[PDB]
Design a protein around this ligand. Structure first.
Ligand SMILES: CN1C(=O)[C@@](c2ccccc2)([C@]23C[C@H]4C[C@H](C[C@H](C4)C2)C3)N=C1N
Length: 370
């Protein structure tokens, strides 16, 4: 039953969402970040100043060494680990246990987050981007293969809403929980199975079309990534977006340090002039060629709590992260190579606007080949 997976996600604002998992025998309890933007099940497996718990392979009777190291450098930092398998469960997920690949993180740099309360990450993307290579079967692949769990999962990230603020959410594994969304689910095709890649065909700020060649929206790719807090946009699209948002909220302006996601902006006790900030609609390619649908997000989503501007620039394509997912119920339909969006039952909104998922919208080549 999906009811037992509701609210199985926790986290601190901007520090990601984690689900509780157990690894090894006896079950070692660990909080594991849900990451649709990577493909490795990787867990702290050695002491670390930010870690209060970690995976201890020696304490596990069911641990099996793969005798193989793995080195994962990335832009912001890195982590190194040792490959092995062990029994893995999600106490508030499917009532199953699977033998999955586990990257035991023995050393890392700027990977773990102070006070985040998670001790590892669950890469939910595809084998193509797994480390060291695509032969290391990702967790969800192992789960589907070893169990009767449907090849599909869905994320309802709720955020906070009215010490870093606490967020809640749900990861429904193996199906769709209809109590988690209202209205209709709209599907955009997963362009290719590595990241969860999609195509954005149009963008609007307060109804105003950005009027850009749609290739710019997906340059060099667009992905859905729960492991990213912000909505991240390619340079050219980011600037056009910020310009439009600066204009719409012209009435009393802010420091450019705020627009850069650096500085924060403060009112007090529900005096925030939400109405001054525009809505943002991303049109995603529909399942039918010349069709599309839009998801519309409020300032309550892209201003995260005093608030920070949760829209930032990208040199690696569009990243639809938490702040865009938080308005909606997102279905990662791997079995049908598509991603569904629907208005979330928990999305934050005032009494004049609401996050929306609306389609269809017709057009009369938006992908960035590879
Ligand atoms: C964009 N992104 C990352 O940089 C991160 C990552 C980097 C390298 C390997 C695997 C995953 C990361 C995961 C977690 C949360 C956040 C900071 C840090 C730790 C890297 C994103 N996961 C996402 N989606």
């Amino acid at each position: 039953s999906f009811v037992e997976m509701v609210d199985n996600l926790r986290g601190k604002s901007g520090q990601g969402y984690y689900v509780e998992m157990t690894v090894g025998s006896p079950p070692q309890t660990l909080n594991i970040l849900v990451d649709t933007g990577s493909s490795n099940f990787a867990v702290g497996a050695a002491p670390h100043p930010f870690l209060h718990r970690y995976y201890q392979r020696q304490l596990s009777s069911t641990y099996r060494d793969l005798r193989k190291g793995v080195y994962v450098p990335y832009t912001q930092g890195k982590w190194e680990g040792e490959l092995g398998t062990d029994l893995v469960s999600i106490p508030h997920g499917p009532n199953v246990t699977v033998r999955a690949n586990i990257a035991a993180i023995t050393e890392s740099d700027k990977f773990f987050i102070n006070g985040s309360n998670w001790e590892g990450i669950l890469g939910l993307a595809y084998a193509e981007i797994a480390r060291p290579d695509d032969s290391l079967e990702p967790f969800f692949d192992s789960l589907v293969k070893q169990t009767h769990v449907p090849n599909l999962f869905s994320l309802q990230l709720c955020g906070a809403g009215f010490v870093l603020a606490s967020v809640g959410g749900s990861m429904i594994i193996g199906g769709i929980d209809h109590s988690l969304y209202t209205g209709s689910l709209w599907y955009t095709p997963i362009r290719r199975e590595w990241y969860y890649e999609v195509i954005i065909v149009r963008v609007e700020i307060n109804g105003q079309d950005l009027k850009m060649d749609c290739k710019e929206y997906n340059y060099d790719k667009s992905i859905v990534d729960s492991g990213t807090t912000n909505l991240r946009l390619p340079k050219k699209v980011f600037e056009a977006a910020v310009k439009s948002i600066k204009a719409a909220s012209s009435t009393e302006k802010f420091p450019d340090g705020f627009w850069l996601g650096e500085q924060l902006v403060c009112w007090q006790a529900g005096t925030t002039p939400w109405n001054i900030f525009p809505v943002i609609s991303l049109y995603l390619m529909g399942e039918v060629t010349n069709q599309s649908f839009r998801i519309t997000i409020l300032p309550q989503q892209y201003l995260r709590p005093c608030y920070k501007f949760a829209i930032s620039q990208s040199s690696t394509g569009t990243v639809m992260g938490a702040v865009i997912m938080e308005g909606f119920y997102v279905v990662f339909d791997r079995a049908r190579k598509r991603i569904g969006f629907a208005v979330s039952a928990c999305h934050v909104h005032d009494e004049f606007r609401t996050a929306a998922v609306e389609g269809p919208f017709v057009t009369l080549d938006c992908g960035y080949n590879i």
